[PDB]
Design a protein around this nucleic acid. Structure first.
Lengths: 413, 554
DNA sequence: CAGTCCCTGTTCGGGCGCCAT
DNA sequence: GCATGGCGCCCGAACAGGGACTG
């Protein structure tokens, strides 16, 4: 309804998306038709044909508590091309101190983008197909008129509009910062929770005034503390145990340059038995403590730089627990995280993984405001099959697949 | 006939012109059965002659239909397709008869000459000019443009399929209670109605098309078990594939085996147990289709038994949305998997076959995991639900799997069907070192320019064994060392190596392999009742590994 | 260290199956 | 100088990325 059409300057020679559409279940399939019809009726989306050399897939989500199927467009591929647009020309600043709060809340400002209408030339690129079951009919094809739900350019355009919409709250609460990312608001305060959760419902009305009604959940950045590497301690040190312990102490060598292992390996000289117990010397304990102390303060000489993508790596650990890392350059880690199980009665590797990813992503945005490529400890096939059935977010990260197993009893746990 | 629907704007790839390739000589009989077709078309307005101002030409031929009576006017726009915008296809996975629900009354109708009824884009007709010779090739013949939808364009079906959807849309809104399966110009109609209103609805639909320029000849179903749809036989309660006739010839060529395998794969649908792991093992090698090749003794075994299963007459059943869905899988040959999907104890919906080597060193459960995800991502396509499974695996066999494994995995609701062979993880490494076992320190090395190398070990009780190597690889040498330690050791072993590579493959606890050496390493592993294996830095001051590295010198 | 070699695993193209034009 | 589109199977060519060795 408002304004005019913003011109999207795409990279020269660069062509748009061409991702095929991947089969869906009746649950999401039936949830999607209508969803589109409603958007078709309200003139948000039009209907197109094969004349369009572009596509992108679509699927239905169903987040917890709410029983409203949200429609998500995997604009995962399209965004990388429009990076010039939503990074340079229309850049949404990131509040340095956003992470330094005692509570932040996730707001779903999705439907608030169907206001402004899309450029006419660029509309071409945003097409999507909706498959029929057992191919009852050739999947119908549609296209977008108004700002899309997922595109990372939607809020780079709405950015002018949104700041004026939050003018009063931001101007009268200097202790409450906010961050807009894709299709989800990020409001973080500092005061008590009971006097915070009320500021949220109060911010919901402010927006509800100009047509936003979408009910999020609590999360505090102060709860997050670093977990380095713990060098086990025992009374009886078998050769076998000293073998592994040097291994772990060797990887540490690449991260911390002050790691010494010589003195320690000197007591293994000569082919010895494996179970055979060995007593620790004076110079060995002068290092066992030397290393256990140097393994406290993060790696000196490492800073953040937005000039390079963000990379995330996860390693299973068992019991349903998982552990991950977040770095810019190999071995120059940024955050050394850890993930706990959601408790019992939910013994599922895939579900926890998808959960871990979101729980990592969220902290990527919050903290810096980018999204990391996930080296995912799972098979391309084993994931592409249920990575939706357990997804509950309005954002999709870039990722890859690692298959290499841990070496020395996992260098972390 | 033409002009009922709107023309889709098609453009030529930017920078390029149109097709300027001469028409090649044709069979003398074809021309007289072709010109006889071009005039009937110009008569109905499908085509129109042009002048010399049109410098575009594109070869054309002809071929009898699936009947042998009527012919088919085919054009070769291979040089155009390279110049026509890259459309996006709208057609997806073909429909399947096991996904059909039972309807009290059903009929299917077909459109005659369907491509020749959709108006082609206006300013694009100028690039579809074909030149037809006379009769004796004395004087140049006629040259008309494909005023209508061509037959060999770049995305011809994409436009038709799309247009066919828009024409049926209005009829779907008024009648959203009846079933409609539109594949090309062939559509399957049917509902739980009655003869009276049904036939009226059929006439209602025929006349709906008739007005849209879609004439349907009296070539529609007659409402009997003999229902020709998508190449099958849709009976009222059962269903079978196209009466399949397997080719049998004394000698076979690379091509003649291809025409069999694919024909055999098609029968994997309703027919259970059909495999071709070996039959295809002959397709290996950069072969030419005409090249003659004799069947292997194992290959002649499959082809002989498969020839007997096809002799057996079988039928599938239709889907019921109220009842539960169970897919039962079982293992067959080496790296072979066949599965039957059903809902009634004996009536199957669609059987299958999974046979792939996902990696150099797999495993039986590792293959079974993927043999499950292949049926899932194919069961979702037919029905929007992931079915329950009847797997031949013990619940403790799986539990131990994903608990000691690194790459996350998982399988849906499954039970344990006790049908041999039952998949099991044979051997198992020990988490902790063993006491009273010889501590083999194994390592290997190889030269990059000579390709030869020494691989060996040493122990705690003084045990040394190093041998040479003709043409091995540094990484391969390390693997050899591990092999030695399994021949020169008792039921209890302790092994430590400097190579993750080496560590890796074992850690995963594999069954099959394609390295011969590794396929052998397991043979031992299976027997040794308690094994432990540790790792250690390569070029490090570590003890034990210090000396065996020194031993593989020169 | 930048440069090579191995080894694995994914992606592409080519021919066949079947459906339809 | 013998066509299009879709899905499927199978197979070797090409491409990719990670670890270990080398002047």
């Amino acid at each position: 309804s408002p304004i005019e059409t913003v011109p999207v300057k795409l990279k020269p020679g660069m062509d748009g998306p061409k991702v095929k559409q991947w089969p869906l279940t009746e649950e999401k399939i039936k949830a999607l038709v209508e969803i589109c019809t409603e958007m078709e009726k309200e003139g948000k989306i039009s209907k197109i044909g094969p004349e369009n050399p572009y596509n992108t897939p679509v699927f239905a989500i169903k987040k917890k508590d709410s029983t409203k199927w949200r429609k998500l467009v995997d604009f995962r591929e399209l965004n990388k091309r429009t990076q010039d647009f939503w990074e340079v020309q229309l850049g949404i600043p990131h509040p340095a101190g956003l992470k330094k709060k005692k509570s932040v809340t996730v707001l779903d400002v999705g439907d608030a983008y169907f206001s402004v209408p899309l450029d006419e030339d660029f509309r071409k690129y945003t097409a999507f197909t909706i498959p029929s079951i057992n191919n009852e009919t050739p999947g119908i094809r549609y296209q977008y008129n108004v700002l899309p739900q997922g595109w990372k350019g939607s809020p780079a355009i709405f950015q002018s509009s949104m700041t004026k919409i939050l003018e009063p709250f931001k101007k009268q609460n200097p202790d409450i910062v906010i961050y807009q990312y894709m299709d989800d608001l990020y409001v973080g305060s500092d005061l008590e929770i009971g006097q915070h959760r009320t500021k949220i419902e109060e911010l919901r009305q402010h927006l509800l005034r100009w047509g936003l009604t979408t009910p999020g959940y609590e999360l505090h950045p102060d709860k997050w503390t670093v977990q380095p590497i713990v060098l086990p301690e025992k009374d009886s040190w078998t050769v076998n145990d000293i073998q592994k312990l040097v291994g772990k102490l060797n990887w540490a060598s690449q991260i911390y340059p002050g790691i010494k292992v010589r003195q320690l390996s000197k007591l293994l000289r000569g082919t010895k038995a494996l179970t055979e117990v060995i007593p620790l010397t004076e110079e060995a304990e002068l290092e066992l403590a030397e290393n256990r102390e140097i393994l406290k303060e993060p790696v000196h000489g490492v800073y953040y730089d937005p000039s390079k993508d963000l990379i995330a790596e996860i390693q299973k650990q068992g019991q349903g627990q998982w552990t991950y890392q977040i770095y810019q350059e190999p071995f120059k880690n940024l955050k050394t995280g850890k993930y706990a199980r959601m408790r019992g009665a939910h013994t599922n590797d895939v579900k926890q993984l998808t959960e871990a990813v979101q729980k990592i992503t969220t902290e990527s945005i919050v903290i810096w405001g980018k999204t990391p490529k996930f080296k995912l400890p799972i098979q391309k096939e084993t994931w592409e099959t249920w990575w939706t059935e357990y997804w509950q977010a309005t954002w999709i990260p870039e990722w890859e697949f690692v298959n290499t197993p841990p070496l020395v009893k996992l260098w972390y746990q | 006939p033409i002009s009922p629907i709107e023309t889709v704007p098609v453009k030529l790839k930017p920078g390029m012109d149109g097709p300027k390739v001469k028409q090649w000589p044709l069979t003398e009989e074809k021309i007289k059965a072709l010109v006889e077709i071009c005039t009937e078309l110009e008569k109905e307005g499908k085509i129109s002659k042009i002048g010399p101002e049109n410098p575009y030409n594109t070869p054309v031929f002809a071929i009898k239909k699936k009947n042998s009576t009527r012919w088919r006017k085919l054009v070769d726009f291979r040089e155009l397709n390279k110049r026509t915008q890259d459309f996006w296809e709208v057609q997806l996975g073909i429909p399947h008869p096991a996904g059909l629900k039972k309807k009290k009354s059903v009929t299917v109708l077909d459109v005659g000459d369907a491509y020749f009824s959709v108006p082609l884009d206006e300013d694009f007709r100028k690039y579809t000019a074909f030149t037809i010779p006379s009769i004796n090739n004395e004087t140049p013949g006629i040259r008309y443009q494909y005023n209508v939808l061509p037959q060999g364009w770049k995305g011809s079906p994409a436009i038709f399929q799309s247009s066919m959807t828009k024409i049926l849309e209005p009829f779907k809104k008024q009648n959203p209670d009846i079933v409609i399966y539109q594949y090309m110009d062939d559509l399957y109609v049917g509902s739980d109605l009655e003869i009276g209103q049904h036939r009226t609805k059929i006439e209602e639909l025929r006349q709906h098309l008739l007005r849209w320029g879609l004439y349907t000849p009296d070539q529609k179903h007659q409402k009997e078990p003999p229902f020709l749809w998508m190449g099958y036989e849709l009976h009222p309660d059962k269903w079978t594939v196209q009466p399949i006739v397997l080719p049998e010839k004394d000698s076979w060529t690379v091509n003649d085996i291809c025409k069999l395998v694919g024909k055999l794969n098609w029968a994997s649908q309703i027919y259970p147990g059909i495999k071709v792991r070996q039959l295809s093992k002959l397709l290996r090698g950069t072969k030419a289709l005409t090249e003659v090749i004799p069947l292997t003794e194992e290959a002649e075994l499959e082809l002989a038994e498969n020839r007997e299963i096809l002799k057996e007459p079988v039928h599938g059943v239709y889907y019921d949305p109220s009842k539960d869905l169970i897919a039962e899988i079982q293992k067959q040959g080496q790296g072979q998997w066949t599965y039957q999907i059903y809902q009634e104890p004996f009536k199957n919906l669609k059987t299958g076959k999974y046979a792939r080597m996902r990696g150099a060193h797999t495993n039986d459960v590792k293959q079974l995991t993927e043999a499950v995800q292949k049926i899932t991502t194919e069961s979702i396509v037919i029905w929007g639900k992931t079915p329950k499974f009847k797997l031949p695996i013990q619940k403790e066999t799986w539990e131990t799997w994903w608990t000691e494994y690194w790459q996350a995995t998982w399988i849906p609701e499954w039970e344990f069907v006790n049908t041999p062979p039952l998949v099991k993880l044979w051997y198992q490494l020990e988490k902790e070192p063993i006491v009273g076992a010889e501590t083999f320190y194994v390592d290997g090395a190889a030269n990059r320019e000579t390709k030869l190398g020494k691989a060996g070990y040493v122990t705690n009780k003084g045990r040394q064994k190093v041998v040479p190597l003709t043409n091995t690889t540094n990484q391969k040498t390390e693997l050899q060392a591990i092999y030695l330690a399994l021949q020169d050791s008792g039921l209890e072993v302790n092994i430590v190596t400097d190579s993750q590579y080496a560590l890796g493959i074992i850690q995963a606890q594999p069954d099959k392999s394609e390295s011969e050496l590794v396929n052998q390493i397991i043979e031992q592993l299976i027997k040794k009742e308690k094994v432990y294996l540790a790792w250690v830095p390569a070029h490090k001051g570590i003890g034990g590994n210090e000396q065996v590295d020194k031993l593989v010198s020169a």
